[model samples]
Target: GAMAPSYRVKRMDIAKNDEECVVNAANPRGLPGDGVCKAVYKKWPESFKNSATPVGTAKTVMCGTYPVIHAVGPNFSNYTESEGDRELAAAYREVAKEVTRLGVNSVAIPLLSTGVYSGGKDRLTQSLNHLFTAMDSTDADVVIYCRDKEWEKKISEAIQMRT
Candidate 1:
């Protein structure tokens, strides 16, 4: 069979969204800051592997027992919308590449940016745009985790289109 990648929009925290891997939407060097990155740091003693990555990239670390992949989505203020979108897309692409490199069959991802990085609704849409597209090559079961109901609904709608 081909790469029949399955997708899901789950209502929970990423720390609770257990899978073969969980992606930590982080910054370069996996710095300690707010949002999911902060939560991950709080939950695990070995929180980071120390290089996610520069913007537009991803790296994996064994956080406790999880093959947590850290992704550096573009921080908004320094870059324009178009600039950030491309960077964010590349971040997702790099995650997919890491997925193949790690040979994992399942991964849990959070919509990157939009936290302290301050990406807005348009960023949300663009994240879905890039994420699903970048995931095209993987046969892994992908879980999209959301802690907010509003975002969960939006993501559910987006997943329905599959465009």
Candidate 2:
């Protein structure tokens, strides 16, 4: 149930099972029946730095089926750079490495730099190459869900190249 191809991103409104993780496009501490974030700053106050009360965001987490809402796209700092997409892709690759540990069979993802961020096709393709290409696992089935049709196409294209 992905939205598109370019960025076949995944999402969940509530906290996922210990075996699943969410992309967490929205703010962390994820809203009740609202969104998912990588780190539940609220549940784990020590996860974040300043903001308390469990209503904040944190670095991306790839804990697998246990479910986490990780923020994709560009951050304020990276947005200012010309190679922000490249940087973001690198980040996604790192996340993928972590995800592999959870021993999940199906892993869903979104276009890292497409939304609120401006990362484009080339960026996504590059990141995925670094990620999926490294391992061809029968136990891991990578799925790419996107924000829209155009994005889906792009992601699908990327998948074909990587596979």
Candidate 3:
């Protein structure tokens, strides 16, 4: 809603008790008192359907509403994987491109590979650095919301001129 001159990047902390809080964006599986179900419901109080079948997950049926928010994610899924470091970098670049294409003057992102993903600073920093380097798609403000203090400082230093 703000103008281009006023546009600024934003950072946020997903305020919750857990490392990864799943909000009820929808059907909960596993009955009334399952730990996993309860955890899922804590974030997504409305619904959460665990995929027993393969197609629902492979085809993006899990988070159908995400497109409304200009979303993009990995094909292999985001997890605590060693190989994800490279993929995450590519994904960030894609995200930047999409946000720029939306005619928005800025981009905002949370700690892209932290929290439930268990991605450490080294991999996260590398991914972010790669994205920053590759994205010359627009003159948009690239904002990264990092919960880790040390990581924030390093990123700040890395992009010192831009910041």
Misplaced by over 4 Å in model 2 are 1-19, 26-65, 69-72, 76-83, 119-139, 161-163
Indicate the worst ten consecutive residues by lDDT in candidate 2: 49-58
Q: What's the number of clashes in each of the models?
A: 0, 30, 11
Off by over 4 Å in 1: 1-4, 119-122
TM-score of each: 0.89, 0.51, 0.49
Residue 126, model 2: lDDT of: 48
**The candidate that achieves the highest lDDT relative to the unseen native structure:** 1
Per-residue lDDT of candidate 3, residues 1-163 (tens digit): 1243211222344223221111111111222222222343344433334422111111112233321111222323443454565555655555555554455454444434344333333455555565565455456554555556677767676666564
TM-score leader: 1
After the best TM-score superposition of candidate 2, give how far the Cα of residue 156 lies from its true spot, in angstroms.
2.3
**Local distance difference test, candidate 2:** 0.42
Q: After superposition, how far is residue 35 of candidate 1 from its true place, in Å?
A: 0.8
